[PDB]
Design a binder for this molecule. Structure first.
Ligand SMILES: *[C@@H]1O[C@H](CO)[C@@H](O)[C@H](O)[C@H]1NC(C)=O
Lengths: 400, 28
C-alpha cells in the first residue's frame, strides 16, 4: 500500500504517523532524518595564494645594445636602462664605461608553501539535496539513503520510497564561493584574466603545478644608482594576505538555518528547512488484519496536568475495555500534539498512562488507540522554564 | 553579553568547544 505524508525536514526528531487501511489493523511508523547532505556542483576555474616575486639575474653588455624580448611568464616585466657601471668586488665588470646598457627582469611565480596554504575559488549551480532516512514499521526497522527530487526512488529489500521536491528551496551559498583550508567564504572573486592589483585573485592558475600561470600585480622597475649591482623593483602588496587580513567570518559561523558546512566535497550537513513530502510503499506482509489484533470496546480520556513546553510536559490516562491482550499503538491525530510512545501493551480491562507534548495553550487534540478516537479537553499553564536544550518538535498553527 | 534567541533557535560557539544549540519557549 502507498502512503504519502508531509514530514517536516528537521533532523534529529522523530515523526510519528499511523496508517489506516480499510480492512486491516493500523500499524505505526516512525521516520527520523538521521542525515541530510546538500551538495552543490562545483568546478575549479583557478587557484590562488601568496606569490613569490622571483627575480632573474641581471646581465649586462659592456657598451653594446639590448632589446626587450616577449615572454610568457606570469606578469613578465622587461625594461632596458642606460649606463650603470656595476661593481661586484673588483670594480670593473665592463669596459667602455659610456652606455653600459643593462637589462632588468621580473616575474611572479607560486610560493613553495602554496601546496597547503592556497585559496581555490568556486562557482556553484542549483544544489540538490540527499537525505538519509531511518524508517521502522511495527517491529521491523530499515535504514535508507535517497535523493530529493521526487523522481529517484529508494529501496531496502522491501520498500519503495519517493521523496521531494522541497517546498521552499534554500541555498546558503552565494554565486561565488571561495575555499581556503576548509573554510568556506561567499566572497565575490574577479573573473579569469581580469586580475585586480592588491585584491583577491591577483595571481591565477588552473592548478598548483600548472605552467599556464597568469597574473599582473604591477611590478615597475627603477633605474639603479648604486655602483654595486642590484635591481630596484617596487610593487603593489599581495592581495592574498590583504584578503586574509580582511577576511570576515566563515560560513561555518554565519550560514542560516544552523548547519555545519563540510568540504571535500563541498556540502551542507544536517540543515533544517521546510518540509519533505515522502510517499512510502509499505509492503503488504507487514500488515495484519483487524481480526488478529484485538480492538477495544470503549475508551475515555482522563487528562492530567499539561504544560505547552518543548519537552514532553503533559500526562494523560486512558481507561479501556478490550477483549484480548494485545499491542495496540497510540497516535494523537492533531497537528499540535505528539506522543512520547508509539505503541503499548493493552490488557482486557484496565488503564494506562501516556506522555505528550504540545505548543498551544489549550488542549483540543484527538487520541486514537487501534482505530477509534476519543477527544481530550484541558488547559495548559505557561512553562516555568525559559530556555530548554531540546528543539520544538511541533509548530503552532494560525490563531490556535 | 545579552543574546536574544528566536523560536527557531540559536547556536553559539564559545571558543574551540562543540557548538551548543538552544531554543526559546513561550513563557509569556
Ligand atoms: C541585559 O539585560 C538585563 C535585563 O534587562 C539588564 O539588566 C542588563 O543591564 C543587560 N546587559 C547588557 C549587556 O545590556
Amino acid at each position: 500500500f502507498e502512503h504519502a505524508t508531509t514530514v517536516p525536514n528537521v533532523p534529529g526528531i522523530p515523526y510519528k504517523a499511523l496508517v489506516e487501511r480499510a480492512g486491516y489493523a493500523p500499524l505505526n511508523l516512525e521516520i527520523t532524518v538521521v542525515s541530510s547532505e546538500l551538495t552543490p556542483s562545483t568546478n575549479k576555474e583557478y587557484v590562488t595564494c601568496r606569490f613569490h616575486t622571483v627575480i632573474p639575474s641581471p646581465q649586462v653588455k659592456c657598451c653594446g645594445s639590448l632589446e626587450c624580448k616577449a615572454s610568457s611568464k606570469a606578469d613578465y616585466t622587461c625594461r632596458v636602462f642606460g649606463g650603470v657601471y656595476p661593481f661586484m668586488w673588483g670594480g670593473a665588470q665592463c669596459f667602455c664605461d659610456s652606455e653600459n646598457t643593462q637589462l632588468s627582469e621580473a616575474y611572479v611565480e607560486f610560493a613553495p608553501d602554496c601546496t597547503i596554504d592556497h585559496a581555490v575559488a568556486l562557482k556553484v549551480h542549483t544544489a540538490a539535496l540527499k537525505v538519509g532516512l531511518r524508517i521502522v514499521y511495527g517491529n521491523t526497522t530499515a535504514h535508507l539513503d535517497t535523493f530529493v527530487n521526487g523522481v529517484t526512488p529508494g529501496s531496502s529489500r522491501d520498500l519503495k520510497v519517493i521523496a521531494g521536491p522541497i517546498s521552499a528551496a534554500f541555498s546558503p551559498f552565494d554565486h561565488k564561493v571561495v575555499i581556503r583550508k576548509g573554510l568556506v567564504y561567499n566572497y565575490d572573486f574577479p573573473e579569469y584574466g581580469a586580475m585586480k592589483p592588491g585584491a583577491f585573485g591577483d595571481i591565477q592558475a588552473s592548478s598548483l603545478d600548472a605552467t599556464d600561470i597568469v597574473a599582473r600585480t604591477d611590478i615597475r622597475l627603477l633605474k639603479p644608482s648604486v655602483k654595486n649591482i642590484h635591481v630596484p623593483y617596487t610593487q603593489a602588496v599581495s592581495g592574498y594576505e590583504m584578503w586574509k587580513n580582511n577576511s570576515g567570518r566563515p560560513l561555518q559561523e554565519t550560514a542560516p538555518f544552523g548547519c555545519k558546512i563540510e568540504v571535500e566535497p563541498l556540502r551542507a550537513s544536517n540543515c533544517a528547512y521546510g518540509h519533505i513530502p515522502i510517499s512510502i510503499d509499505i509492503p503488504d506482509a507487514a500488515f495484519v488484519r483487524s481480526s488478529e489484533s484485538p480492538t477495544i470496546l470503549e475508551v475515555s480520556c482522563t487528562v492530567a496536568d499539561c504544560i505547552y513546553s518543548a519537552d514532553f510536559g503533559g500526562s494523560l490516562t486512558l481507561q479501556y475495555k478490550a477483549d484480548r491482550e494485545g499491542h495496540c499503538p497510540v497516535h494523537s491525530h492533531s497537528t499540535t500534539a505528539v506522543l512520547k510512545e508509539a505503541t503499548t501493551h493493552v490488557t482486557a480491562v484496565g488503564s494506562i498512562t501516556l506522555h505528550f507534548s504540545t505548543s498551544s495553550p489549550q488542549a483540543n487534540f484527538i487520541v486514537s488507540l487501534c482505530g477509534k478516537k476519543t477527544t481530550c479537553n484541558a488547559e495548559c499553564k505557561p512553562p516555568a522554564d525559559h530556555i530548554i536544550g531540546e528543539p520544538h518538535k511541533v509548530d503552532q498553527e494560525f490563531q490556535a | 553579553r545579552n543574546f536574544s534567541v528566536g523560536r527557531e533557535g540559536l547556536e553559539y560557539v564559545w571558543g574551540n568547544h562543540e557548538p551548543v544549540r538552544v531554543w526559546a519557549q513561550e513563557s509569556a
